[PDB]
Write a protein that binds this ligand. Sequence first.
Ligand SMILES: [Zn+2]
Lengths: 241, 392, 372, 156
Amino acid sequence: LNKQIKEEERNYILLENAIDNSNIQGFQTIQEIVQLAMQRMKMIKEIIQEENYNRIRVANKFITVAIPKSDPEYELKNKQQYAKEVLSHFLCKMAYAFYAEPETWLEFARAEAFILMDKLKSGQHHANFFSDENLKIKTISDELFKQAFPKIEATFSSIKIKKDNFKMFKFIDHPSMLSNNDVVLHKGYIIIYKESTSKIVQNIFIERLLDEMRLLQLKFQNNGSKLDDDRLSFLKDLHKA
Amino acid sequence: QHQNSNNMTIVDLFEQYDPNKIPNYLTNNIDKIRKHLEQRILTFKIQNYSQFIVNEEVKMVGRLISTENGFLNTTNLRIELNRNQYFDLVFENDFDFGNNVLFPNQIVMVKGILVVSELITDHISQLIMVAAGPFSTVMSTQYTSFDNILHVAKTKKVSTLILLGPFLDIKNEILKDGSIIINSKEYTFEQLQNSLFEKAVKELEGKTQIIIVPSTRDILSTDSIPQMSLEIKVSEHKNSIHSYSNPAYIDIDKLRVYIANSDVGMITLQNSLLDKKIPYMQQSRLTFKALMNQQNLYSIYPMRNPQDSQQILETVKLPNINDFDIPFDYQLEQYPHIIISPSSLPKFATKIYNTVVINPNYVIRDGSQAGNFAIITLFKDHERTRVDLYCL
Amino acid sequence: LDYDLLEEYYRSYFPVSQMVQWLSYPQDGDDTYFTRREFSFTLQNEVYLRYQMYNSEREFKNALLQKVPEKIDIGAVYDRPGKKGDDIKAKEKEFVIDIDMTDYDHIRTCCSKAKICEKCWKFMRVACDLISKSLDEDFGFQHVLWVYSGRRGIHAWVCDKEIRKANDYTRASIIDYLNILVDYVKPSLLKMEKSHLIERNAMKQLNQKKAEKESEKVFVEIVLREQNLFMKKPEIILEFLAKRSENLSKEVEKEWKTLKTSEQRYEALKELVSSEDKKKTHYLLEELRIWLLYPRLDVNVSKSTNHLLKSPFCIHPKTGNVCVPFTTEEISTFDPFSVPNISTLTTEEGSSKMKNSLKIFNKFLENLKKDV
Amino acid sequence: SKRNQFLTSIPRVLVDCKKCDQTFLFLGADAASILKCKCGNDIYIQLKNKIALVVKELIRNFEENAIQIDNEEFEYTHQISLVGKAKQQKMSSFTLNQKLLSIQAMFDITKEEQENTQKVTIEKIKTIKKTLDDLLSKSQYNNLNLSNIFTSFGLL
Ligand SMILES: [Zn+2]
């Protein structure tokens, strides 16, 4: 009982595997899925247009609902809420993976990554990513802390300090972060502030999520097109809006 | 008599679909038909025809379809095996023709370089009431024949009666397009049916069991030919009434009767081809022999109206019709004791494969008052039944 | 001229076993390192031979002597041997950096752009130490191998444990950091803030708070510039100064017409830009010095994870040069006029010269074989 | 609004009233609160019967599946062959689903409008509505099971 709650929560936040909706009371007919797929794409488009994230979700009702256990038909509420988020994501992903170019998937990757950060920030537990980020973070040695002390204080001027500086990274693990102007480099090693631990979260998430689309496109390019008609005509519309 | 009705205990044997999960209620697909047919041809090949032949000559089994969309002729019958083998039949050179019936959708075995086999199955006190619709005179809505039918039924004290055929059809109520009565009241379809069935139960007083079988032309049942459960609403609460699917197979105390509710014999005979100079009774006998072999009477899929290609008399849902199939191997049991096939063929009552078939035609046939029906009496002590037909 | 080369191949390329050992990398413990390595040869009159993979050293030198390889190339290491079939994927390749004198053509004026002059080599002399300091301070990179090449500049081979198997994206990320001369001035990513890190060290101005200080930083570029060109072409730097307000450019152009001397012109420019604002002018000497001295890293040859390069000790009769080895500590002493050549024959001086070449090469060879 | 795109495809529904007959383009400009003819009669019963007949005719028309002859011929046949290449129904399920949904939507009422009238009319409205709502609920095309549409792409 508790274990399947934990697994469904992991699938809710990480959002990587799908479910079935035939037995779900609400989302059965072809009509409801149309608006369900339209709402998330609308939210994504406005998110990328404006660059308030929590103040966005309150507009489109996507918050996980709060309701006491004593409320009748309690299982309906969370099943409906769980169905919304899982079904919405894959339908939107399916559109880009088939029709958009690889130089155009980055817009979708950024939008989903950003809402991911909001979910973890307001979420009660980040243990899904907490364990893995321990594998990447490495505490700065006190020897190296004094070794580059003139260099560290050169880049860092404003405060908005031994513990303020955060655990450091190996160069080979994250080559993309050197081009950032906020990092300090000393003999193939990098020292970063603690608030960029959110930045590295998006870096890995984008790379893996962008990988699937090319694989998803590859699993489709070998065929001609979708075989069943009531979906193929539909998914095309979810590209321009 | 009364105790006999008290000990009726009627029950059916088919598995009835749950009214909320009909597999193919609206959606239809071509590919699934092809897969199902390709499975069933192999099933027949493995099970039935294999016992006759041991592996220049060639032997194969296949399905018969019309080469041209027009009505079939001896030169255009064609045999098909699978996605690849796709051939013709040319056995007309010698003009020889066996005692067999060929119709579209039939699965037959043929061998040649021609001999055809048709899946031959190896040879081997109570009274009932049978009535056929319609019950209202054409261009009239009085339903007075119902009154005299029940008059006869309650005069002869029959244990149980079977009512079958359209009650409110699209051939009588389309003209009225409404209901008006002498006492200045407006009625609807459901209220009319409730009035009719209240009349039935109050005239019979629930002393006898009643069996109702709906038909396609009924205006309330929108389903196709494998329709089911024409819902009955009645004020009387005693469970003297019953409803069943279109092709039914019900269980009397020890009697098992199979019902082909709509005009299968006439369509099968007229659509198919058969040798000439054969008497009409023998024609019907051979057509039913052919239909009994394929374990299902609704063998023909197109069943187009004769001389009218565009018009279709009955709508059959192909994927869902093979569920009601019943096999015949008399080595174990004789499964259908009585076959009821109401159709426009001449009245008859005969025995085939140690089972009896009856054809009580429609009462008030073709608008004339000269209706007719039939009764059956059987005695149990192995299987002796007395059958006689009554004309109005 | 091919007969002399054919006779001389027995003497041209001594480091056969040394090259095999360098490519072998015995510390890794894997075998067939020489087997998988790409090689390409160039023959007389446009004939090109590629994927001339030799598993044995003996057949390697036999083919080397029998043919006429006017150019010898080094490639990467693949999955499996074989050529033009099975579309082999490459495993590993060493990191390379290329430097030439073409990017300094628009600055220098004392040479005819076809042959080098003694006044121009100082640019290479400063570029070598600049890039070496960058690599050593910013990365670990405990091994370096420069090579002088032909009639022009040098390359920068590297051998290290991890970077040999680095993917292409990491290669791009590394080469991005070492390029600062963005094509027209240094990019705003560093201009936007004070107390930067990279170009401050790249300008020989360490952490400091001053006449002796300014003199000891400026004298380098003074020696390199005020003798080769000594601001004979004002337009070259007036165009850059035009990036700022037209008033300052007008002031400096009006001022310069009187002095008509180079060092005094530079001092006048420094005085006229020292204290004319606090924010509008910023680092104005720094970007000028970087743009006028820093070398432009090539991004063509060192781009892909697989490529072909001119090997050490290659000889090409046009220009008569020998691509002698090099090392980081050799920067302060090297010259481009003492190199051996085919022309010397039966001469003790040239003998001592290539003996020194081999000993310098062996220095790094056993340095790597011991440090691994 | 939402009513034009469903008014554009409604099938013919003719009501036979006393001394008059009119086509039934009901909506819910039109006074949705009241459904009666110009006459005093509410024409309820004839409306119900006509809906029953028209839906029966629509279903019976659909069930007689016929495919389009190959070689770009518009002729149609009901005999389907095992080696037939062409596949195009004369009346695909999409059209029937759209028509049934239109006939359903031409009779519904918003919650704001119903509270201002008597309960008898609204209960009659839902009594008529359920007759089509239940027929929509049991379809195997309106209801969509989308597990198999992407489980072939490696997703649970
Ligand atoms: Zn009227």
